[PDB]
Amino acid sequence: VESFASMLRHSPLTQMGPAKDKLVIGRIFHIVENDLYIDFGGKFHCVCRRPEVDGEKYQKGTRVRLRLLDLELTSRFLGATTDTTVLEANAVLLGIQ
Amino acid sequence: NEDLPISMENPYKEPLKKCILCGKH
Amino acid sequence: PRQRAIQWGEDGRPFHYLFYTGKQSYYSLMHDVYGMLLNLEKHQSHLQAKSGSR
Amino acid sequence: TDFNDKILNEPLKHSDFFNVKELFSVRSLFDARVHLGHKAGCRHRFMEPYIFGSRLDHDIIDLEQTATHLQLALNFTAHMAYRKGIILFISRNRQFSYLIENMARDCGEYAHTRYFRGGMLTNARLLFGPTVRLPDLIIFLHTLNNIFEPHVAVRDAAKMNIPTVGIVDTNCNPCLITYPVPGNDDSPLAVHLYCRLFQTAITRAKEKRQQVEALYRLQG
Amino acid sequence: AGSRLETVGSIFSRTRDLVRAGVLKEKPLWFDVYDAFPPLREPVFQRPRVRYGKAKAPIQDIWYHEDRIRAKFYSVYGSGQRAFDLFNPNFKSTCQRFVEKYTELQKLGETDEEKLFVETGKALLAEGVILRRVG
Amino acid sequence: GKATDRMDAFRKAKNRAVHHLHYIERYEDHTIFHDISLRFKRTHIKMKKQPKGYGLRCHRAIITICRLIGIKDMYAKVSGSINMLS
Ligand SMILES: [Zn+2]
Ligand SMILES: [Zn+2]
């Protein structure tokens, strides 16, 4: 009896509303000894560099806090028929858990 | 059934920024 | 010189998995070293969580 | 041999011989983040009747016609591998190039997530040798590569009369694809679903071949 | 294999006309697999165009009253102390609980929105959760 | 085809033409169905439908390619530019 509208009407991405200054939790899936790719959810993921404090604490599978900005964040140019996609979210990190 | 999308006034819109002297003479 | 062996039989299916790409052994070795790299990364993560020649 | 061709055309009369209905669920596709899409500016032209609506400049791919076109694509790839077919995963993407190549090796298939040169499947008479059996089926999990431009393998497939079952998202060109299906292909947990559904299709096509080999071997 | 003209149209009709001619005396297997289970649209080649004039995109959006409720909630208060967990399909955050309380109070029978809003606020304050708002 | 020698150019043209084929539906294998009035670049070609009791009042190359295809009764008319490939 479950249709399609009721599936995304109660979806978290529709409950959060706008993606501007929202407290979201994420996980770590890949580290390139410099960046902490946080996969909070959705289509893309967030990126951030290693902070000066708690460097060894953030490992693969660390629950942190993010401000959650634009999910895709794209912008068209002058002479471009379409806009490019960076596949990045870029959210400001807050604290631990 | 009654969960169809309705095109309304489109919320999530903050008041546009005005000038620093628009409200004065 | 070392003649190139035949990788396909009478049925037509090649014997190597990564054959429809020009280079087969090079890409297989690349896949193997990438697997070894990710295995070493997983082993290093597990170790951190559970604490002449040319 | 007429008996060898009659046993192959028997499951064609059935609307769902392999039973590909219980492989997915109406609720499992929602938890895997499939209905998601890009922005409203990067939306391709041939992508209007495949989108249910927008959610703050975010198109939502409808799962109603998605599951309809998905079962018609899985059933098409099932009968190909059943009659000694050759598949090829061509998806130039630098994020999951390891999981795609291993699923084709464990099941005895073929993958191609590397750089595409020039005269591969087109000029096969002076590259791989004299006569080479070209793959009669190419699976495009990621149509757009790392430059945002339609790949050349989908253009050369229709040239040599070769079908292609690809996964079109919202910024591709689903014109030369004979079995398109609107669906996201950029989420980490989403691409693991399509890669596993294609693995289960092999376990019901080539592994199910033994069920019909014993029927013809009774005579000699 | 056969005709190398992909700009004409779909491959099904071209292969059918090539087999019906007499130059290719071999029935393809993929052709039989295709005609055994036809899809819904022939893969024809259509040259993309660019919109001009009054031609727009006939793609409707998705909006509800809950969006306006959450907008008013964010304008009055702001972000809650609970973090959104997108991994849980049925994750009830602060905004979801707020809109559920709002709709279950509206189902009664009142016309003033400010009274319902302050009633929901007092109810959520006296329940247990304390929304640390700004001054 | 394009090459340096005549025989090599002919061989290249044949090898490229044996791989590029089309298909034309014919009414009774002598005349096409309806009449088409289309244009290509600056070559306005227009043909009609003729019964079995009619000759071939088309261009030399047009008559040649229609005999190669299988058309025996057709009346065409070209105007504007006089280009072969177009
Ligand atoms: Zn002003
Ligand atoms: Zn792509």
Helix locations, chain F, DSSP H? 6-17, 60-69
How far is the C-alpha of D120 from the C-alpha of C21, rounded, in Å?
7
**Nearest by CB to A6, which of B3, B5, B12?**
B3
E36 token code pair:
């055994």
The number of residues in chain C equals 54
Please, what is the end-to-end C-alpha distance for chain C in angstroms? 26
How far is the C-alpha of D67 from the C-alpha of A3, rounded, in Å?
13
Residues around ion ligand 2, judged by CB within 5 A, are: D 142-144
In this structure, are residues A69 and A20 in contact, taking their beta carbons and an 8 Å threshold?
yes
What does DSSP say about strands F43-48 and F75-80: parallel, antiparallel, or unpaired? antiparallel
CB-side exposure of F80: number of CA atoms within 13 Å? Answer: 14
Using beta carbons and an 8 Å cutoff, which residues of E are at the interface with D? Answer: 1-4, 6, 10-12, 14-15, 18, 28-30, 32-34, 36-37, 39-40, 43-46, 48-49, 57-62, 89
List the strands of the sheet with D138-140, edge to edge.
D111-112, D89-90, D138-140, D164-166
Q: Using DSSP, state whether C15 is helix, strand or coil.
A: coil
In this structure, are residues A97 and A61 in contact, taking their beta carbons and an 8 Å threshold?
no
Contact yes or no for F20 and E21 at CB 8 A: no
β-bridge mates for residue D156, sequence order: none
Can you spell out the DSSP letters for F65-79?
A: HHHHHT--SBEEEEE
How far is the C-alpha of F79 from the C-alpha of F86, rounded, in Å?
12
Report how far ligand 2's centroid is from the alpha carbon of B11 (Å): 33
E87 by Cβ neighbours in 10 Å (0-12 / 13-18 / 19+) ranks as middle
β-bridge mates for residue A24, sequence order: A66, E84
Residue type (1 letter), D58: H
Q: Nearest CA to CA, how far is C44 from chain D (Å)?
A: 19
Contact yes or no for A83 and D60 at CB 8 A: no
Contact yes or no for E43 and D31 at CB 8 A: no
Chain A residues inside the 8 Å CB shell of E57: none
Report how far ligand 1's centroid is from the alpha carbon of F67 (Å): 81
How far is the C-alpha of D208 from the C-alpha of D83, rounded, in Å?
11
In this structure, are residues E120 and E105 in contact, taking their beta carbons and an 8 Å threshold?
yes
Please, what is the end-to-end C-alpha distance for chain D in angstroms? 13
D164 token code pair:
């292609």
Sign of CA dihedral D168, A84, A17, E89: positive
Residue position matching structure tokens 């009633």: E119
Type and span of the H or E element at D202: helix D188-202
The number of residues in chain D equals 220
How far is the C-alpha of D169 from the C-alpha of D186, rounded, in Å?
9
**Nearest by CB to C18, which of D98, D111, D133?**
D111
Ligand nearest the Cα atom of residue B18: 1
How far is the C-alpha of D169 from the C-alpha of D150, rounded, in Å?
12
Chain E residues inside the 8 Å CB shell of B6: 63-64
E6-35: burial string, b at 16+ Cβ within 10 Å, e else: beeebbbebbebbbeeeebeeebebbebbe
With a CB cutoff of 8 Å and minimum separation 6, the contacts of F11 are: none
Q: Using DSSP, state whether C38 is helix, strand or coil.
A: helix
In this structure, are residues D22 and D50 in contact, taking their beta carbons and an 8 Å threshold?
no
CA D55 to chain centroid, in Å, comes to: 28
With a CB cutoff of 8 Å and minimum separation 6, the contacts of F64 are: none
With a CB cutoff of 8 Å and minimum separation 6, the contacts of F75 are: F47, F48, F50, F54, F56, F57, F58
F57-68: burial string, b at 16+ Cβ within 10 Å, e else: ebbeebbeebee
How far is the C-alpha of D97 from the C-alpha of D191, rounded, in Å?
11
- Which residue of chain A comes nearest to C45, CA vs CA? A60
List the strands of the sheet with A24-31, edge to edge.
A36-39, A24-31, A64-66, A93-96
Residue type (1 letter), D54: S
CB-side exposure of E57: number of CA atoms within 13 Å? Answer: 19
| Cβ atoms < 10 Å from Cβ of B12 | 14
Residue A80 phi, psi (nearest 5): -135, 125
Nearest to D164 by CA among D69, D94, D88, D81: D88
With a CB cutoff of 8 Å and minimum separation 6, the contacts of D196 are: D103
CA distances (Å), A23 to each of A62, D55, D87, D187, E37, in order? 16, 20, 45, 21, 49
Chain D residues inside the 8 Å CB shell of B12: 56
CA E65 to chain centroid, in Å, comes to: 17
Longest Cα–Cα distance in chain F = 45
Report how far ligand 1's centroid is from the alpha carbon of E134 (Å): 30
In this structure, are residues E102 and E76 in contact, taking their beta carbons and an 8 Å threshold?
no
Residue D90 phi, psi (nearest 5): -105, 105
In this structure, are residues D127 and C22 in contact, taking their beta carbons and an 8 Å threshold?
yes
With a CB cutoff of 8 Å and minimum separation 6, the contacts of A72 are: A43, A44, A85, A86, A87, A89, D38, D39
CA D105 to chain centroid, in Å, comes to: 16
Residue position matching structure tokens 């990564």: C18
Helix locations, E1-135, DSSP H? 11-21, 29-36, 65-76, 94-106, 113-127
Residue D204 sits at the vertex; the CA angle it makes with D199 and D207, to the nearest 5 degrees, is 100
Are chains F and A in contact at 3+ CB pairs closer than 8 Å?
Answer: no
Residue C12 sits at the vertex; the CA angle it makes with C8 and C16, to the nearest 5 degrees, is 45
In this structure, are residues C9 and D132 in contact, taking their beta carbons and an 8 Å threshold?
no
What does DSSP say about strands D138-140 and D164-166: parallel, antiparallel, or unpaired? parallel
Contact yes or no for A9 and B3 at CB 8 A: yes
Given CB atoms, is C49 within the 8 Å cutoff of chain A? yes
Q: Using DSSP, state whether D198 is helix, strand or coil.
A: helix
3-state helix vs strand vs coil in chain F, percent to 5 = 25, 25, 50
Contact yes or no for D53 and B5 at CB 8 A: yes
CA D48 to chain centroid, in Å, comes to: 22
How far is the C-alpha of C34 from the C-alpha of C29, rounded, in Å?
8
Q: What is the 3-state secondary structure (H, E, C) of chain A?
A: CCCCHHHHHCCHHHHCCCCCCCCEEEEEEEECCCEEEEECCCCCEECCECCCCCCCCCCCCCCEEECCCCCCCCCCCCCCCCCCCCCECCCCEEEEC
Type and span of the H or E element at E94: helix E94-106
How far is the C-alpha of D70 from the C-alpha of F9, rounded, in Å?
48
Chain E residues inside the 8 Å CB shell of D76: 33-34, 37, 39
Nearest to D135 by CA among C14, C10, E9: C14
With a CB cutoff of 8 Å and minimum separation 6, the contacts of B21 are: none
How far is the C-alpha of D25 from the C-alpha of D204, rounded, in Å?
18
| Cβ atoms < 10 Å from Cβ of A91 | 25
Q: Using DSSP, state whether D69 is helix, strand or coil.
A: helix
In this structure, are residues A11 and D30 in contact, taking their beta carbons and an 8 Å threshold?
yes
Contact yes or no for A4 and D64 at CB 8 A: yes
What does DSSP say about strands F43-48 and F37-40: parallel, antiparallel, or unpaired? antiparallel
Q: What is the CA radius of gyration of chain E?
A: 30
Chains adjacent to B (≥3 CB pairs closer than 8 angstroms): A, D, E
Contact yes or no for C22 and D120 at CB 8 A: yes
Nearest to F79 by CA among F34, F49, F21, F39: F39
E78 token code pair:
């702001």
Given CB atoms, is D137 within the 8 Å cutoff of chain E? yes
How far is the C-alpha of C17 from the C-alpha of A95, rounded, in Å?
47
Q: Give the technique used to solve this structure.
A: cryo-EM
β-bridge mates for residue A64, sequence order: A26, A96
Type and span of the H or E element at D153: helix D153-157
Residue position matching structure tokens 């990126």: A47
Q: Using DSSP, state whether D98 is helix, strand or coil.
A: helix
Report how far ligand 2's centroid is from the alpha carbon of D142 (Å): 4
With a CB cutoff of 8 Å and minimum separation 6, the contacts of E86 are: A12, A13, A24, A40, A41, A42
E32 token code pair:
């039989």
Residue type (1 letter), A38: I
What does DSSP say about strands D59-61 and D51-54: parallel, antiparallel, or unpaired? antiparallel
CB-side exposure of D185: number of CA atoms within 13 Å? Answer: 23
